[PDB]
Symmetry: D2
Subunit: 475 residues, 4 copies
């Protein structure tokens, strides 16, 4: 399976199903986080490159265009085709993802790529099921709504789940007849660029998808400010998302959906299946080195089970292993101190591993409290702050005390507690006796400052459609 | 019979509504709203600023709070309160119509039968949605139970314009309340009256205290404090495009609160030779001129096919001149004063522009009499795409009539602008009508009609005419947050 | 709170057609009697095929195109429903009384349950009236495809005596909401309330012919409906055997559309981790409510071995102690059984339990004979084989069974040809959701019983009927989906 | 383009149960014949009640809780469906040939229509599988209320001879994506495609017992299905008379649920302001498509007075210039009438037009002396009362009526007990939309005919049937709504 010495075939700007060099001629250079060594130079796009791509997108989206004349099932066939090719070339994409992220290949293969496929097929099924409405009004009137495509849509995605995150936009966008302008992170532009090949092979017309790699303030900012981009979807940081919205509003009031991060709680009750709670919550905090937006950053446990839970979690940290079949965590592309200075107790880790890359030991705090920064600030790293609570009412308030709400998980055997907390928590997703359970068909998103809009599920389709009303009076 | 005008009406409600009680300014200060038609001040209203907005939002926050009387209601009870509140709006209907006529110059009958009828039907429409706001059960794995909950957002803000002060406020109030969240309103400074009245009724109907708060004042002040507030979660704005940008930006800078916008448009009205020319002429007239031409749905570009063009203009001239202008309160008046001195200028300045860019003036072209702010109905012909009266939002009684030859031509000319609120089409051809309707980049396309809106039919803009939608089942999307619950057994 | 009307005179006793009161064509009458005070009440007009013929033509002319009903706006149709729930509220106590008279229900149960129900249901569907939406469907680029959700037409409603007005409202509300016209037909034992409601339908302002009532007998009038060439849909609630007949009748005649609510043998399942008090009080109300003369009745109560005994003892403490008596007294929870016949039907079966060996824990005999009153009975050591946990008991009898495992209780509970309702008591999340999924009921309650909403659909599985009443799902039953496909040149 | 397989060799002839081929309990067989080469094709096993019991039993078990088919995840059910649409595509030419041999349908027509439909239908619903959603309903603060859309159980399908594979797929597609198990029963006159589809259902990986097929006769196997106490829903497409019977039996037995799709006396209304040329060709393909043997068939063509005479002249030109012949020849647009009973039935009604005074503009007879081929036939000056304006012909006959007023045509169109389809030709926005409202039909076409999509529901008003097929609307017919209500 592993393809360790894989050649990179695609490094240029995809626009109109043709490969392109920068207008400047500049390149920048991506690196294998694991080796620290350069992989290849890929083309560095800037403003003029974006204009080129957006004019492509507009032509493809023009009325009379081939892409627009396609009937509805056929937009669906194309995606089905595109999924098939991702699946065909699954191991490559998996291998390229590992090459730019450091993600374990098996993980990329079974998680990132599994996701891209399912999502692509999920949303192939919506293409002929995008329905407006016939609205009753007056006897002498025929009023209905059309769910039109918006137009040119841009995607701007982060480095942790590059392809997946990109695919979450692409799948629905195209399903609804939009045309796109993608920008993967500077750190990880390989699998995106590969996919563009696959988008050509699958048979999408020219300029329905265009890709310009580069930097945020150059390429990204060119998009968000662009007067002919109609809609945008960003996933990345709270700090940058605001800029995107700020930029959309100054420009053409383009539509923005944002998926940013969060201070996601896990809430463990005395009556929980304690083992599972320790297990899941550990998969919550530490998965991908804590470099996942769904990351569990705040673990709440009830007094009766507090000391027990911690022991078990300290037990979990040390015991799992460090492209191999057995590798569970890859390299990183203080808060730990301020926890010590503010009085929290550390039961394991607290420093780096051995002199081989930016790896932190799994670190677990106990005696944590709300006022602490390890409970207030996005760690983006393998730190497990366990906090104590007594009242289900207390924990509901404490849990909701951040400006975020992307995720929450609640462990309990009690039906009434399960649904209570579920209604009370302010989070786009509430897991009950699981963590990281996501589906192409279940919507995902954030409350409050974790984002706007939703991705996946039917709800996704609203973000890539413009509702037009046609109201007809009869004589 | 026609309700009888209340010319002597005494403003009862002038202060800041917060927690179901009236309060004066944190500063003490007050501003003054006048009657466009009398030129005479009506009264002084409390002037609000940040410290007041903050007092209000904490009411809204406390009432949205978990456990609060407002949150524990049945769905249907929330819906019943909405019904009650329309009942009061209908009982005090003539009174509320009169306020809106004193404040804006609107003909009394128009406010009575249009503005208030809208508020009523819309409150009732959304009263209806209260216990029909439904999430989903979603199939996944055998071992998993997955479903969504359409939750209320939290505190919602409303900032509205002067042209439809109550209506634009209601369009936001109705679904916002229907969906179980709390509010903080700011009406336009030029028109704070009818919204303040709506305060008293929202109390009488039995909405718990703190569910609705109304802090009148200015845009850069109260408008800004609302837009930027850390504990406001959604905002609905209706107003000038320029001020939307300002609001969306601030939302974006502050807490990423969510934002619906309704901005202006440059709405095309397309008339084909095979149209019923009378209907077309009659509809485009009311489309241009309704509400003193001060409405976003206004027809700022009438496009007419050459075969029927000359007569179109001829019939459209009749309607312009025959149209009664004068006292809002007189039963025969269809046209009242422009809201204030500024718009009266803006409109005049631009009318001169139409003559200074060479358009053939067919009626009016001037103020009507020095008394006040009354502009003659004006019609321009031999109009072209590049004149200012053909690019800019006139927001006054002015009917530009352009010309075209082919449908494919008129679609491009229609779609040339950055806005897309409304379009209208007149033709007897089934194919033309549906072609145009598909092609026009407007949120509402009308066919053989104009200004046909329904509470059940959504309203909003393409491109730079705005973001979300208002009215319809669609409107509940802007007041709900989707929460996904996923359970593994 | 509200004061009984002990001797209320019946005003409405005649055939309602075109908002006019008529007497039978034959001239016959029939007479309804009071279970609590066995005195005949009044004589009510007995109709037959020719009376039906007359209503169905009213209903047709009323559904005819151009008619005032048909031309109403959506919202206006909902206003009419809304007003009808207002008048039902005003005369609520009257209605409660007539129902309480005709059926024997405690007056207060008729007031806070039956009529509460009619009102909420009427108000809920008034709210659907302008929200009954079809679809625009993406097909080809050259094509406009959309569905219209149209009214079926003349719909007939045939109802039982256990909840005379409620069952009639479940059908009238959504039917009129989607724009159909109706012919109604209450049970012969209970024609009073319906006939009343006709006066209200007239007052509230629905045009003539929209709703007609024709009381009478089943094999006479009911059969004339089910067989009727110009009736387009039917809803029937009642017994299975009559059900199948109406379906057959329909198939032969014009393939009119049919939805059925029939009985069920509805299990309660109780688990050891249940809230034990809560589980007895729910199981108790559930078996015994409306003298056990309810389709939702719990006929088979399952209880886990560990927690069995103490269940039985708390059940009998509820059973002995619950006050039986005169409907009109504030403190009576149980009234007479509907009549002499249904009062004896059950007592036969009370021996079934004693015959095949089942420990009776309280009651067991008819109490006093000059009234239709059975003492609340509870059986224990009940088993699957026994007729008491197998045939529709139609009354106040609590068969309590025994089980060990969750898998055991899932096959047993499912082993009937019925599945209208189920209930589950446990504090466990996985067990509850498992069972909710596993059981084959149209409604599964969890730690509650008889929790119904005008919002939540109700209807059976298998032989318990077909179709759903209440909720959004109802409208499906009162509409005919039409597809309009248009190709553009 | 695709090549006829003229003497194809039939592989599948037996009863399909638990993904195994079976012989009748009787051992008896019945013979299938080719309408164009009046020769027997092969013998098929002939089922009866004991076979049906065997099949229902299989399908109960496959539906059983904990069964593999019940445990497949949402998306996987839609994967298997896609797979099958894959196999149907691969073997498209074999199948399209069987259907022509079985039915007399022009190979190319069966290929690019019947088989096209099946695949798009399969694919469409493969798509709904993970999108079948119930609702979360707000009630009290106290309460969590939601619905589930559960499969009903064992579904039966009974289908006619005119579109054996198509009509079967309209039922199987939504039934299988909603999680059901099925017992199929194709027409005795056209069993072959349904029997081939079993190998694909097997090859594609559906578990044993999910789909079962019992070829045979109406009163035996249909009646054993329709009456079965352990079959939960029945989908019937066929004659009104058998519809009624199926429905009664459903009622009498276990109150099983019933969808029906019956015939119609569909109108085609042509106004003077139509694109006459467009109207003539659409009406023409409407009446004669599938040798007239389709339930969407345009059996009353109303034409406004001005364009009436002209309309008739063009209609005969198409009528005579339509190639009738060997199904397998590329040029042939019309084939043989399904068999002898229909062939005879059609010709009597033609004589009925003659006996009642309709002006015959072409045909009026059989063609090649002793085949099952009828010359395309056009009647003119037709009136509402004649037998050709009243009874489903189901043959290449085009009865043409005249009208004056719209309201008159509305009334005349709606005068039958049927409402399956209608169609309207006009350029006029108002006139089209007014008729669309007024015509009591499940499907109204405007400036087209026979335009169906796997996303647009189809079904009857009035006695043309109850319930719907195709579109989201179909999933309701293959599911049972369950309300779950929790009190905290
Ligand atoms: N084409 C367009 O987009 C468009 C649309 C409407 C009006 N206009 C122009 O605007 C003028 C009148 O203004 P208007 O009331 O219609 O719209 P406006 O945006 O000036 O006012 C609408 C509301 O916004 C509030 N507001 C003002 N400044 C604000 C700020 N900085 N932050 C938050 N809220 C603020 C005001 O108080 C008022 O409540 C007219 O001359 C008209 O021509 C243009
Ligand atoms: N709308 C109508 O009235 C209509 C439509 C088409 C054909 N027909 C008549 O029927 C004949 C052709 O029949 P068809 O195949 O179109 O439909 P059909 O109703 O005769 O039978 C079609 C399907 O139903 C089955 N079936 C037959 N009898 C049954 C029974 N007793 N119980 C259960 N299932 C049964 C058949 O075997 C087949 O599977 C024609 O000669 C014509 O006269 C009537």
């Amino acid at each position: 399976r592993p393809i360790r010495n894989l050649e990179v075939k695609f490094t240029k700007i995809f626009i109109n199903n043709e490969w392109h060099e920068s207008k400047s001629g500049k390149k920048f250079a991506t690196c294998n986080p694991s080796t620290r060594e350069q992989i290849c130079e890929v083309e560095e796009g800037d403003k003029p490159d974006v204009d080129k791509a957006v004019e492509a997108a507009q032509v493809a989206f023009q009325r009379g265009s081939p892409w627009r004349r396609l009937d509805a099932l056929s937009r669906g066939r194309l995606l089905h085709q595109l999924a098939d090719l991702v699946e065909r070339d699954r191991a490559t994409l998996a291998a390229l993802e590992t090459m730019d992220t450091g993600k374990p290949f098996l993980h990329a293969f079974f998680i990132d790529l599994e996701g891209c496929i399912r999502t692509l097929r999920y949303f192939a099924g919506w293409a002929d099921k995008i329905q407006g409405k016939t609205i009753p009004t007056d006897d002498n009137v025929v009023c209905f709504t059309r769910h039109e495509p918006i137009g040119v849509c841009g995607a701007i995605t982060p480095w942790n789940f590059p392809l997946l995150m990109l695919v979450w936009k692409l799948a629905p966008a195209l399903c609804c007849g939009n045309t796109m302008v993608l920008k993967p992170a500077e750190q990880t532009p390989l699998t995106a660029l590969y996919l563009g090949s696959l988008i050509k092979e699958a048979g999408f017309p020219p300029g329905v998808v265009n890709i310009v790699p580069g930097f945020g303030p150059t390429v990204g900012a060119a998009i968000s400010s662009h007067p002919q981009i109609n809609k945008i979807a960003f996933t990345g940081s709270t700090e940058v998302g605001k800029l995107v919205k700020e930029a959309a509003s100054r420009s053409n009031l383009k539509r923005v959906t944002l998926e940013l991060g969060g201070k996601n709680p896990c809430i463990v009750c005395a009556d929980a299946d304690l083992d599972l709670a320790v297990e899941c919550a550990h998969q919550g905090v530490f998965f991908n080195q804590g470099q996942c937006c769904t990351a569990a950053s705040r673990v709440f446990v009830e007094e009766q089970v507090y000391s027990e839970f911690v022991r078990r979690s300290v037990e979990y940290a040390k015991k799992r292993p460090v492209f191999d079949v057995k590798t569970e965590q890859g390299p990183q592309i203080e808060l730990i101190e301020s926890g010590k200075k503010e009085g929290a107790k550390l039961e394991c880790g607290g420093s780096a591993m051995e002199d081989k890359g930016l790896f932190i030991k799994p670190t677990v705090f106990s005696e944590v409290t709300d006022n602490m920064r390890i409970a207030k600030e996005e760690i983006f790293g393998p730190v497990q702050p366990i906090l104590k609570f007594k009242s289900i009412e207390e924990v509901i308030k404490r849990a909701n005390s951040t400006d975020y709400g992307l995720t929450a998980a609640v462990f309990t055997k009690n039906l009434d507690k399960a649904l209570k907390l579920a209604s009370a928590l302010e989070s786009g997703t509430v897991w009950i006796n699981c963590y990281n359970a996501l589906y192409a068909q279940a919507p995902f998103g954030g409350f409050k400052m974790s984002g706007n809009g939703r991705e996946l599920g039917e709800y996704a389709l609203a973000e890539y459609t413009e509702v037009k009303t046609v109201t007809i009076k009869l004589g």
